[PDB]
Amino acid sequence: TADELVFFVNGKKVVEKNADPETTLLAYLRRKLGLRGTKLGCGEGGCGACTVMLSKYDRLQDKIIHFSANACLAPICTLHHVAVTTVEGIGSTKTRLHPVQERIAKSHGSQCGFCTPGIVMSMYTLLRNQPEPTVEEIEDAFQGNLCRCTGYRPILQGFRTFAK
């Protein structure tokens, strides 16, 4: 009666045999897959704590496209044949940090740390599309990401390092 949902998370095949249409990707990542890096901060698309990168072959444009999305509003049933990247998909203190992770950490851009994965994924996405962005492109990537702790200055300053 019911079809299989197949997607990928951090390079790994996820085969959901009983997808519920109501299930969000945030719920799936956190509570089925056990990938708790992606956070719930509002559930209404306004804070970006739940930011992940989505990737797919665009039949029209021909290429693979990469973009950021709020996992709190993404129904898993929209993700058939899509590839999800989370904060744990890009680097780890157990293996090696991604440069985006190192620089936000070392630049004092993370205080309580709850917005950090979301902002990391916003910057990371930007770099997957534009490896040499401008300062303006950098500020722009974060219009969907809130931080209550840092006053934002350190985050931009650490990421400015990626421009020119």
Partner: protein, 745 residues
């Protein structure tokens, strides 16, 4: 020795990789259930019936819980004036009536929505104005008075009088309230994982609720994704309900609030109303001041009394006022009980002070910097509460900020922009602050630590303070590393827990570094003294060899450390005794451009000079200054909570409540820490930094007022010495309407 070095936050790398564990990231037990609060939709009403029929049809529904389920006691809250679960009557929208427990959080959400309550509405009191009209107050009038008021006013060249309102603020910690409760099944024992700044009250309120000794309850706090005062007491609303569910079911139970529940239920900063009368000389010299403060406390006392006390202690800001009377009252209303929010009543009182100070300057037709400077305290001066200002560094901060911000040159250029532009105006203001350091309740100024050295020489530090992003654990590691004379890599802090350090004060009042720093230091000293003989026996040996020798000689490598802040004890009866240990000082200068036609504005530049003594960690301390400043900029310029007339909150998420974004911060944002200003009163000459910078946010508000003043001087009745009321927050609505023109008319 890293003390004074910009060591990054110890957890930042793991925070960036998503490896740092927050409460809801803890894995679930196989049998773990989920709780969701069932809450009042009425501001004031009798509960007639509760019908759970529909909830019971939801897949995975376990139970509904209410006041009848509680084994111990339904009375809770700091002053024992709250219910855990409301019984006959609700007293605010958001008031907790019960909880559903289900097998998934989605099922608990669904079941909670379908719980049907029947009410009979009773008449409600929502506004401060309503509360005053009904004499609906908690306790009696608070008052600080000094000098002769009916002498000062008799003598004053002029007076200014008026009324000012400042709206509240939601904490908007990125991680909302969260508790996991694990029932052990033996002797009422329960272990709780909680996003709270107050593991002591959590522990005590759970035990009281359950009817069980406090020694049965273990509360553990790894870290919070922000607290800001909001998890200092209101975290128990979730914790106690979760404990009850664990007790009833015998299963582990968790709850993390959705943002909308959190905004409605858990309280925010206190809104303040002030009526004031200031008397002054033609010179701008203040001769008398009378201020009556009113806070909107909501539907319980909570911390409201202490928040008003702090307001009263800061109604002077940095100004000497020979004759002064301040009063505070706490308005009892049908709103969620309001609570601690970074600043704890200080920013409200300081804002009231800068508001009339700004009106004094306009009335006398003098430059604002000149009137502020000429009224400033001097070294050795006493405050209105009769405490001496020792090491009063505002004059240095002021002078250095003026110089480095190029204030006088840019003030010229602001004036040129204003004469050359019709429908956009620039403003520029420079504001000081002082903020007193200590809990104003003397008994909270105590701190414990517990340190173990294991036989490999690694050190485990435990102290009563919690980490919420402010880098307290980092600072304690730098302290211990310096005190033990070993590198930071040998030392670890895992968590805060009631079984390692009991009876801890909430992590609050900006004093945590000072008091836990001292506790940690004393414990380290004890360790060094015990190790000293072994050092002498093996002088060219290593830390590890000394520890192992001490171990084998049966010398204990475990110790407590304790600090009690000396010489605190202010009396409202005698208007004497120190209320604070010392003060933290700062000055900010901010420039804005407003759009006269839309009420929008751009923050152009801000320069801050902050006295934090000799910083333990300049990077953390600057980070604290910038964070606090931006929270203050949000309080005064962006964030607005809005209620229906029936008292129900409209603004319940980031789409209707705007905290500062990446684009809200000043384009040029400079922060310097005052150099060569050691503080004899705290650990390693440092000073508390967490809360004192927030009010500097007001510099953006007074820059806005300055720009509105120019817009009015262009388009309305032209009196240079014309005053108008601008409440906080200065939103686009208020800014626009105040730019009276051919369109507003």
């Amino acid at each position: 020795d890293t003390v004074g070095r910009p060591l990054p936050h110890l957890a930042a790398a793991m925070q960036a990789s998503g490896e740092a564990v927050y409460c809801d990231d803890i894995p679930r037990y196989e049998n773990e259930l989920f709780l969701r609060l069932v809450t009042s939709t009425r501001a004031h009403a009798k509960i007639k019936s509760i019908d759970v029929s529909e909830a019971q049809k939801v897949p995975g529904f376990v139970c509904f819980l209410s006041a009848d389920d509680i084994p111990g006691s339904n009375e809770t809250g700091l002053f024992n004036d709250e219910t855990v679960f409301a019984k006959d009557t609700v007293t605010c929208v958001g008031h907790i009536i019960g909880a559903v427990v289900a097998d998934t959080p989605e099922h608990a959400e669904r079941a909670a929505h379908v719980v049907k309550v029947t009410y009979e509405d009773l008449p409600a009191i929502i506004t401060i104005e309503d509360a005053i009209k009904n004499n609906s107050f908690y306790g009696s009038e608070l008052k600080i008075e000094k000098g002769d008021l009916k002498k000062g006013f008799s003598e004053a060249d002029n007076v200014v009088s008026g009324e000012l309102y400042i709206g509240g603020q939601d904490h908007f910690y990125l991680e909302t309230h969260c508790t996991i409760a694990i029932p052990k099944g033996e002797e009422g024992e329960m272990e709780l994982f909680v996003s709270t700044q107050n593991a002591m009250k959590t522990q005590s309120f759970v035990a009281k609720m359950l009817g069980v000794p406090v020694n049965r309850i273990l509360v553990r706090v790894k870290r919070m994704g922000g607290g800001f005062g909001g998890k200092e007491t209101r975290s128990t609303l979730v914790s106690v309900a979760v404990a009850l569910a664990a007790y009833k079911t015998g299963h582990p139970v968790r709850c993390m609030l959705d943002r909308n529940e959190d905004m409605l239920i858990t309280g925010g900063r206190h809104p303040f109303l002030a009526r004031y009368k200031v008397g002054f000389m033609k010179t701008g010299t203040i001769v008398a001041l009378e201020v009556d403060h009113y806070s909107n406390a909501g539907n319980s006392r909570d911390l409201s009394h202490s928040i008003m006390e702090r307001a009263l202690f800061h109604m002077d800001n940095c100004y000497k006022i020979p004759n002064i009377r301040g009063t505070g009252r706490l308005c009892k209303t049908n709103l969620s009980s309001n609570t601690a929010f970074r600043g704890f009543g200080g920013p409200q009182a300081l804002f009231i002070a800068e508001n009339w100070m700004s009106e004094v300057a306009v009335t006398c037709g003098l430059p604002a910097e000149e009137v502020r400077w000429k009224n400033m305290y001097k070294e050795g001066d006493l405050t209105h509460f009769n405490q001496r200002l020792e090491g009063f560094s505002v004059p240095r901060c002021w002078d250095e900020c003026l110089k480095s911000s190029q204030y006088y040159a840019r003030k010229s250029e602001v004036d040129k922009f204003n004469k050359e532009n019709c429908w956009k105006k620039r403003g520029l203001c420079i504001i000081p602050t002082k903020f007193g350091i200590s809990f104003t309740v003397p008994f909270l100024n105590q701190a414990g630590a517990l340190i173990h050295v294991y036989t490999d020489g690694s050190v485990l530090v435990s102290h009563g303070g919690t980490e919420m992003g402010q880098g307290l654990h980092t600072k304690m590691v730098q302290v211990a590393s310096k005190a033990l004379k070993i590198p930071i890599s040998k030392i670890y802090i895992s968590e805060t827990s009631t079984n390692t350090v009991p009876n801890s004060s909430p992590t609050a009042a900006s004093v945590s570094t000072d008091i836990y720093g001292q506790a940690v230091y004393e414990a380290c000293q004890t360790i060094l003294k015990r190790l000293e003989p072994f050092k002498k026996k093996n002088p060219d040996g290593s830390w590890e060899d000394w520890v192992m020798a001490a171990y084998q000689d049966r010398v204990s490598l475990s110790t407590t450390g304790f600090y009690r802040t000396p010489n605190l004890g202010y009396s409202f009866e005698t208007n004497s005794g120190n209320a604070f240990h010392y003060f933290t000082y700062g000055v900010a200068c901010s420039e804005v451009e407003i759009d006269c036609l839309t009420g929008d504005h751009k923050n152009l530049r801000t320069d801050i000079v902050m006295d934090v003594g000799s910083s333990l960690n300049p990077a953390i301390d600057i980070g604290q200054v910038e964070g606090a400043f931006v929270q203050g900029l949000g309080l005064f310029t962006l964030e607005e909570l809005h209620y229906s007339p029936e008292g129900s909150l409209h603004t319940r998420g980031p789409s209707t409540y705007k905290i500062p974004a990446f684009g809200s911060i000043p384009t040029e944002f400079r922060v310097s820490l005052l150099r060569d200003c050691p503080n004899k009163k705290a650990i390693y000459a440092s000073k508390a930094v967490g809360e004192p910078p927030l009010f500097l946010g007001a510099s953006v508000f007074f820059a806005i007022k300055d720009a509105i003043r120019a817009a009015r001087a262009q388009h309305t009745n032209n009196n240079t010495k014309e005053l108008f009321r601008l409440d906080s927050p200065a939103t686009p609505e208020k800014i626009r309407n105040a730019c009276v023109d051919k369109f507003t008319t």
